[PDB]
Amino acid sequence: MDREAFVQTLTACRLCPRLVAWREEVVGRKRAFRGEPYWARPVPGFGDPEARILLFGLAPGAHGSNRTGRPFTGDASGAFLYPLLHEAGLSSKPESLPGDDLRLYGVYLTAAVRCAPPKNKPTPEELRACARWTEVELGLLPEVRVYVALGRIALEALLAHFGLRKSAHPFRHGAHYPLPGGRHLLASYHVSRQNTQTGRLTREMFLEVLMEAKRLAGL
Ligand SMILES: O=c1ccn([C@H]2C[C@H](O)[C@@H](COP(=O)(O)O)O2)c(=O)[nH]1
Ligand code: SF4
């Protein structure tokens, strides 16, 4: 199927009972955004349809992409990620807001799970379920040369997708695994608030990951 079909069928998905309920249940839960329109549905990837770099997150934030409808947009993750994408020379502007004219240069953003999970922690069953969408979504991006896993779970999802052993591709910030055909898998700490607020993942550290992705992608 093409992108239009992918988005239409993905957004209708109701496979995970806990997530179908939660993505809607959280609407209005945060008073700060109560009254605001909520996507409250599976989140389609965002970016260059001819991307050479793919950033792979874990799952939507209840009041982030589950609210705005665009990956990482609306919460702490996007506040950290989007400005760095711009500094790395991979986007048109530092901020990401639904309905804006933001464009990514050869980069596409998505995640292993596409519906907001409680505690931002999907279950193995939910991860196994959404893998069907990872197959469809990555199938629409044949030009990708570098896959950047944001966190251990995202890395494991990519390893499963490519039939790679967890043992031989351990998770650590800065890990780099070459794949057949000049492709590359890069691992980074997730850009969640926990890692960024504590300093575990610094802005310079993430910019370094993006610069490496650019180099490896021939950008
Ligand atoms: O090179 C490209 C082309 C389109 N996109 C995405 C960005 C927007 O969501 C739409 C196009 O938005 P617009 O600014 O209206 O041309 O598709 C991108 O990220 N990079
Ligand atoms: S997480 Fe994925 S598989 Fe589960 S309901 Fe959402 S879109 Fe469907």
Swiss-Prot record:
Top enzyme category: hydrolase
Record gene name: udgb
Function: DNA glycosylase with broad substrate specificity. Can remove uracil from double-stranded DNA containing either a U/G, U/A, U/C or U/T base pair. Can also excise hypoxanthine from double-stranded DNA containing G/I, T/I, and A/I base pairs, xanthine from both double-stranded and single stranded DNA, thymine from G/T mismatched DNA, 5'-hydroxymethyluracil and 5'-fluorouracil.
EC number: 3.2.2.-
Keywords associated with the record: 4Fe-4S, DNA damage, DNA repair, Hydrolase, Iron, Iron-sulfur, Metal-binding
UniProt superkingdom: Bacteria
Protein name (database record): Type-5 uracil-DNA glycosylase
InterPro entries hit by this protein: UDG_Type-4/5, UdgB-like, Uracil-DNA_glycosylase-like, Uracil-DNA_glycosylase-like_sf
Outcome recorded upon mutating residue 190 to A: Loss of UDG, HDG and XDG activities
GO biological process, one term: DNA repair
Outcome reported for the amino acid change (mutating residue 75 to E): Retains much of its activity
Family of the protein in this entry: Belongs to the uracil-DNA glycosylase (UDG) superfamily. Type 5 (UDGb) family.
Effect ascribed to mutating residue 58 to D: 4-fold decrease in activity
Disulphide bridges, residue numbers: none
Binding site for [4Fe-4S] cluster: 13, 16, 115, 130
Gene Ontology molecular function, alphabetical: 4 iron, 4 sulfur cluster binding; deaminated base DNA N-glycosylase activity; DNA-deoxyinosine glycosylase activity; metal ion binding; uracil DNA N-glycosylase activity
